[PDB]
Write a protein that binds this ligand. Sequence first.
Ligand SMILES: [Ca+2]
Ligand SMILES: [Ca+2]
Ligand SMILES: [Cl-]
Ligand SMILES: [Cl-]
Lengths: 284, 284
Amino acid sequence: KVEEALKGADIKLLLIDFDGTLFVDKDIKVPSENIDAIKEAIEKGYMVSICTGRSKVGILSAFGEENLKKMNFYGMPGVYINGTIVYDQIGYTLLDETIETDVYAELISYLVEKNLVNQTIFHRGESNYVTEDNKYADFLQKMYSENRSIIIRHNEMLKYRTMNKLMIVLDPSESKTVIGNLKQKFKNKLTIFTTYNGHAEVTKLGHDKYTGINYLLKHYNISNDQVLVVGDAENDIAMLSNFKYSFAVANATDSAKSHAKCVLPVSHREGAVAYLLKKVFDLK
Amino acid sequence: KVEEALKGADIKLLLIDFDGTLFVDKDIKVPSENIDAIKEAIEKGYMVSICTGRSKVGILSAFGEENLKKMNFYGMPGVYINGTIVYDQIGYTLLDETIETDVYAELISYLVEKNLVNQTIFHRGESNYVTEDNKYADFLQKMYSENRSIIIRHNEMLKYRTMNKLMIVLDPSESKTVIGNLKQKFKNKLTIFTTYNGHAEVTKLGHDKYTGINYLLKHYNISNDQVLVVGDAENDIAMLSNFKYSFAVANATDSAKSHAKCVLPVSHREGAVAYLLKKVFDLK
Ligand SMILES: [Ca+2]
Ligand SMILES: [Ca+2]
Ligand SMILES: [Cl-]
Ligand SMILES: [Cl-]
């Protein structure tokens, strides 16, 4: 099933989702089987780009310094913050899109009246921020293997005129209600993806991983034919539907699985990425 | 609603769908109010781009030489063939994407097997072609006020290695059935949209009006904030979703109506483009 879906592919670019695909959890993180797979990928001439809602530093912290040295990979190139930040292979900033100030002012204003600021992670570039009254200040570290967000007073947070991303950490009690209301309030004003476990990710209208990825394709003159992509959740759908050699992990959402060419027989936990990469390697 | 939906918009680009939006049918073609609207938009300094599944010359035919003079508009800039052909204001080819030759070969092999070749309009650039045994040779001419398709022997048709688009003309009986089987034979291999009349428009994978439009945004450094868009059907949804000042005509499909910011109170035959542009004009 996989070998058939891969037949005839001349693959030059490997686009890998991070959470739910390459990264499994706080504990397993990225299995050594996957670190090896990328290591060999880079030795065999494949361009690797991770495509995530996370930042580069977020991805580098979850990997660890040792694994980076092991792979010889430092998140360049990469599509980050759901395609609003894109670096090339040598670190040039091909794209850095922040939310429009007016819309962003309307958003902070909503988040205050809806009382959600003290549970929002505020992202700009390679940094993220939370308020003094945030009970989940440890959240990206504890649950995603990142560094601790920087804690600042509430009225200092509202001084900033824009962000690349706002992650609203939601209780599974409130998710539906809060996201639905956020979606209708900022319909055609913001991009709002729902995290695997119920949180909201808010970015600039019109961008997602797929549009981030096009910058890399133009830059390095790589066609659709030559892209392998693999992912799991809502913000992977655009890149799963829009490439041919596209793959969903066994643990993917229903939508991810239907929009992908092919659903892998193996979960992220079981080394889905290493499994798929080795089947790409035996083509050449 | 509408003037509310436009509050404080600094619009510099008008992106107008053709059929179902600007162009009504055989007899009405494009209402005179719409022609004046475009005429004035160009005089008031707005960049205008028609975004459609049709070719440029297809749109210029339906318009007629006199209207083009009256508007001072000749389809440039433009997004044509669902984003696979794009012209800048001066007429430079920003993009001419054709189906991959391995996929195209498979596609034609599938069309013969299903005897669909004798009802399929083959598009390359500003030309389109049909087979000697095609009953629908007068189809674009009579139904859509275009120039007649060029007719050639079946064996001549399958000498061609690629096309920008195949529009499979379908009998309203067998739309659901034929497109269904088409969408699974070439899932993640081709873009297949369904026309308002249940016909199949087949283009290269990973392209739509939105991705084509982005060439114009980049070429002229126009931000999303500044883009006003209007449409009606399945092939408009990505541009209605990712833009802020996005409008669906009263006659739009349910999907288009929801993905847009705002549904117009007026339909395409009641002069919806004229209606919307007037409300955009008096912002200034
Ligand atoms: Ca993911
Ligand atoms: Ca249309
Ligand atoms: Cl992710
Ligand atoms: Cl159209």
